[PDB]
Design a protein around this ligand. Sequence first.
Ligand SMILES: [Cu+2]
Lengths: 322, 324, 1028
Amino acid sequence: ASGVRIDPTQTQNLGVKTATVTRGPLTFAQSFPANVSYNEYQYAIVQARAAGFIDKVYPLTVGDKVQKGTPLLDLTIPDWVEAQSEYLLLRETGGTATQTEGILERLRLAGMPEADIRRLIATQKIQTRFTLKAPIDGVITAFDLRAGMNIAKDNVVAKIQGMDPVWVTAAIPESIAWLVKDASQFTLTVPARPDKTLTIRKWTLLPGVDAATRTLQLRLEVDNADEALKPGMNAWLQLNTASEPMLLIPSQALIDTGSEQRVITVDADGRFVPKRVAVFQASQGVTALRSGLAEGEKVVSSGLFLIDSEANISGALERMRS
Amino acid sequence: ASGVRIDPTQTQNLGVKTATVTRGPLTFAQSFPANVSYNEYQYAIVQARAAGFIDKVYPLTVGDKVQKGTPLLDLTIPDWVEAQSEYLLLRETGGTATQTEGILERLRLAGMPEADIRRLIATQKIQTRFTLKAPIDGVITAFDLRAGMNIAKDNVVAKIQGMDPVWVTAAIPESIAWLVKDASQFTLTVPARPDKTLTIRKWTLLPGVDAATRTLQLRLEVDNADEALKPGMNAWLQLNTASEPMLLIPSQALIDTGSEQRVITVDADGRFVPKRVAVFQASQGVTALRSGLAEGEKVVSSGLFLIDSEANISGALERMRSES
Amino acid sequence: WIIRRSVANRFLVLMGALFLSIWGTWTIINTPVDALPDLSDVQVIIKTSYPGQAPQIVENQVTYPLTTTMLSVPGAKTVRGFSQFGDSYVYVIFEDGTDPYWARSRVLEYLNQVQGKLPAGVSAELGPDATGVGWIYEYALVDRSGKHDLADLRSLQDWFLKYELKTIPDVAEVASVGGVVKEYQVVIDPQRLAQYGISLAEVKSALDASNQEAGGSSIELAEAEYMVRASGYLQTLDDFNHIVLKASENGVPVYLRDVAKVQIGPEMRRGIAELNGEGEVAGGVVILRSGKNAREVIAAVKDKLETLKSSLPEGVEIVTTYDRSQLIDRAIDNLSGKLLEEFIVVAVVCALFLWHVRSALVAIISLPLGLCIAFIVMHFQGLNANIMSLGGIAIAVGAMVDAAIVMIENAHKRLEEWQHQHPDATLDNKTRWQVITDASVEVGPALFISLLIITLSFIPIFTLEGQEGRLFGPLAFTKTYAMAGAALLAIVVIPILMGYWLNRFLIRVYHPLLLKVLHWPKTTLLVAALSVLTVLWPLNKVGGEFLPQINEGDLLYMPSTLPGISAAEAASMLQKTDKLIMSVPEVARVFGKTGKAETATDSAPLEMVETTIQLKPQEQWRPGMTMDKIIEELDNTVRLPGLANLWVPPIRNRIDMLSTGIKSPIGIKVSGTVLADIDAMAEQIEEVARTVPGVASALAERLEGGRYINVEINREKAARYGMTVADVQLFVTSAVGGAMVGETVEGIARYPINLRYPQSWRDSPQALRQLPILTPMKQQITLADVADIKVSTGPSMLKTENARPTSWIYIDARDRDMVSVVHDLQKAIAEKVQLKPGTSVAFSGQFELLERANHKLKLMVPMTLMIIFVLLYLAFRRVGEALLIISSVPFALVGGIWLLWWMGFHLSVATGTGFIALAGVAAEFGVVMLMYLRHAIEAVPSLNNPQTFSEQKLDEALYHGAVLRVRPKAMTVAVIIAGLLPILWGTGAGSEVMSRIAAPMIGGMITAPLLSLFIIPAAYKLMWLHRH
Ligand SMILES: [Cu+2]
């Protein structure tokens, strides 16, 4: 029947590894996977203005590099013939100077190219054979018409997309959307060219992220005169930066359950006192806190005070206060 | 005399802690994964009013964001000329206002956009070249018309989807179905933005379940004016749900041996006495009993085990069972 | 006989004892030393880890088929069994004398033919060379500066200290205890697994291919060999984070960091260590090889530490919690001091009876040589210097001089005659030569044979089988060694040494009651037998104990509790208890322990606790505080509800466990083939045991108080989602359980890696029912969709002994004597508790050890009486003669009992020994008493009796024999009682057992002579009349 008493609360006086809450920046240094692709502001799908049949198709195919003016194929279009006569008649009989502009404008609405109309007025002869040329410099990513065939207005004779201001798009993890939004500069580096590495200062963060790989999409243009960076190449987008100053604590200091993150703080006496905190996000073994601690508080950097197997965190933390 | 006596100086050393029995509903808590996706009521699919060909295609591809008004392309539509030149010549030979209106009507319900018609009357000039612009603020998710092409009715020049009142759909496993009730409380968080506290405008529990996943779909409309919630983002939805008012005790205070469940009642004098209770449910650190106690009663939670042991060894437990 | 060929060897026999002393002074200094004769039984354990699998399935498959393939092993005494959670302990104890290493190599081949009849993932790990008793040194690692933590300390212990120590010879194993093993914890988000469309199985698989190296052979450059090494070791947290789980054609991958957080945390804590109730710490126990020197190793350890005390990280100090070297010192630095008592006391006492300085010197040089011969023999033999080996060289010191003086005495008076017949002023070297030899011859036969008596009448002790034979065995050897040494030397040197070099006022108090004893001699014999019966009564009161409760400086505290307790709670319970123990001002350190230490020697559950209690120097205790009075405040101060606490000695317990397995002195085994029955029988006996007059603790560990949350998988429900029983279980083991999936390779070290959901998902049964599961078909379900989860009660620790289930009841009595409680229990149990069919009940512990010794002692008394019968018959040749001495020894036995009662001692194997040796000394007195009487008949006055009768002549031959003994007797019964007197009073480190074994003799050495001074004489004048 001893009236002798004892402190029931858990105790640790044989030394504790402590750290202090510091306001500072979260430092980042990552390498995003990126790809090189065609400039989609340099697109061109060449279709005929009216059906006909292919007379001749120039030596060309998918994967070939064409420049503006490069002939694609020759076709016979007999849709504008009836009207071209109607015009040439107005010349043999000196029709009105506006009766002519009429037939000549219904002819351009008919689809007949502005240049093919001029070759009408100049030769004063009906036009049946036409040649379609590449509208822009680029790569032939499609070529659906060959010799011996016919042609319709839905058919595509050439899908030509360029690449001088070549495109590169990087996939940034959803996680740092809060950071990359206010980024300064990335450093582009492509494995295919160790000399084509350069700093990127202007880019555009797309409003949508990929689902398969939950990643933000960041697209940027690059000068590619020498045709060095070819579309289909891998590339890397480097990001070295630091966040706005936040409350920082060692990562091993945060005891997080599935729904309860918190840290055990050593007070002025040295007594263990668990506090609830709210974590913003971690980086490089140090997590930042949104709210819960003061700038300078002491906190033990160890989740190593509760047996992994099953130290029911709620219960185990409660054994430290009374 | 049911129960068991224990020297207070031992219980004090054990650091015994006790909790008081209360009554009320049990707040259910559970977290489900959800997807940030486009608002399907902000859905625009621009199609040509009539056939023609593309003259101009503005800097714009699938993936870009367009504000309501952004020019998409320029096309020449000839279908409306015959009816226009017929209107302009009647304007010359001053026809009746009814003879005129009737022509601007055959124009209207034949395709030509009202705006381009208002432009016909204001300039008395035949309209041939047209500019198609984004009908709403949103993101471009489809773009099938590039320069050098012909455009058709069935062609889609631009599918524009909005995301301001952005949607977030959470997936709840079918068996759980019951947990989501009308009064349920929801709270969102998106990993991409730990600094953004979201505001749920309204929510709906769709009428059918996704067979592909066997989950009910729970749709949330969330204020997104700053555009921090990009479609595709992961989003965690945590719900709370009140239950039927039940007797409420801490969970560390309840013992279950698979054939009976009980808690150790602390008497008025201090005599620890075990009592059989019937559990109804439990969640988030607290269990709810269907019966076995009465509000006010104290119940041990710290040092429970040893005290139950002492209460077991002293035959108090075998007494509790044989008395009822 | 041989004394004739002695004097002739006057020369080189002298140097034969000179080189014997200088060589006996060398062997003595360099003799090994321990506290006791190693009393541990030879054992070989088999620890197995059958991960996950519940207790029952662990028993049936991995444990049971082992105890049955071990029981039938050559020389196996008994085989005990332990089936805990994920752990299998097979204990194989062998019979006495069975070569340890033989038994080992036997267990190995048996383990080869059963390595097949066992589960696929199981490997029978062979235990260490040592046992639990091999626990010598214990220490805890503490850092008050805070620079280091439990994780860093354990690592320091496992990968530095453990290695700097194991290389110390005679050390079998350095086990770590407590602390924290850093574990790479990959906590997976059930939700992100759905969001990223990656399954648990996929994770584990990916991880299992991101942590190894590869050899690309060699390549020849510049006629040189270039080795192609491929990296790939998992050595950074990032390396964990960037583990590839899934990659698109785009080249955009999905890393492990996308569905999990990689955090460093504690592993499953096996055991827990707490110091002075103010800190949890890590430490290590040093375990000593089976039969190697316990002290020799501790020293090599200390100096090994002082070498490391500099290379330790600034802040780490090694507090010591158990040092067996200290008990060794306090044991040997006591038996030595007590050999100085009897030495200087017997020499001085024989100096007050012998006036001559050179006469005493002869009986004095009888010890230094009797010493040497005892040592140089033990070295050959193979005996170290322990309390029970010196206790033999201490219990015997009294008769060593009794061999020298009884010879000298006969020469002191045999020289007083030559002076009274011859002149007094003429004597030479040859005339001083003859006198001493004649005297030595007349006492030659009697003594040598009676010392051959004391060492053969005592021989029967060797037959003591097992632990006690291991204890008093050395004492038996040492007593015989020094006796036979002081007997064979007394006929080779003693006579020559003595040749080279108020007795009134007792002879006046003796013969008045001697001549009175010749008043109808018959009657005096009867009243002597009557006194023997009055001296028989004291027996009833004295208690019974297997052995005196030896007191070591420290003591273990194990408090038993119900089976279910949780690790965290047991750790809490532990520290709480420590603070209480540290509250008492006699204890200096408290080293608490729950669970086990990294060694197959320790198979303790976290529910069971053993704390080592160091006590301040015995000279610092409060005023009238005793060891027993200390424990009273301990068992009264340290006590929590639902907890029964037992206090024992450290060493004693590790041996109490190796012989039986019971922690407490008193224990009851209830074996059965149905757990529900034996558990029913263990509780009843638990209730009756706590109403016994002198019990403090009574708790019988249950055999099925374990709690279960079982996930009864539904095959049909699971098939719905295309899941196999296996596929569902993966979540039970790794998602819900902390199942280990691998381990990092960090230099010489190694740390585990594991997958798991955050705790919140596996918080409770409710939680497990809503356990998120991403099916093969990317469907999202909960665990309860394919299974029912039910809580239930079942086996907690399937314990077996001889392949038969059993429960142990731990009883703690310490205010009464053992034999009293054990009997009062046999009465209490066998009357109120009606046995059920297949249930057996039998006591064990130290009582089972008393019934093995008492069956030996009772079949050891007749034979010691038959040998005494033949030694009296060989030296006297007379039947009635031998008979009379055989009937006289009982009087000596009887007198030794009163001293036990007075001293308050108990009946032990220690006391039992004292009486067998006492009887050997009684018959030693009985004969040297008769030779004076029988040779009083060889004289002429008594030669007149056979020719013609004389009532006067017969009384004078007896009166002369009485005087012929009062001088010898006064010396014999002096040096003995006075020499044994010092080592009688309790106080002393280890003296606890050396007095229990001394009192029988001393008490009997008073009434043996005092009585056999009148008995034997008044029976030789009553036996001489018959034939006439
Ligand atoms: Cu034990």
